[PDB]
Amino acid sequence: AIASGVAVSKVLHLEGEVNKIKSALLSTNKAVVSLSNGVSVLTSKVLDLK
Amino acid sequence: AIASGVAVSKVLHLEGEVNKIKSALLSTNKAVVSLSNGVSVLTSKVLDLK
């Protein structure tokens, strides 16, 4: 699965960045979901005030 | 950090792709913080109207 020396170690390091960047965007998504349930419930309230 | 011509450039380019996507998600995050500080102050006002 390997043969050197066209970057052995450096290819695994970018494979690590992709798992942090892949998990990073998941938290970002989950924020946009909370902010989305919040704006959903605020809208609901702005209606009961009308 | 590379060895040619076994895709010297193509490993360096994707190594580049990861640096923009990392700054990219950083700007995306910065928006979700503003829209959230914004919805926070809008909420504050919808409360002062109630």
Binding site: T28, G38, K45 | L25
Partner: peptide
Amino acid sequence: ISQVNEKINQSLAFIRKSDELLG
């Protein structure tokens, strides 16, 4: 209203985790 603010509280906590990974 107090619950709309917990949604913003927990969305802002999700960005600091995102940014805690960058990195």
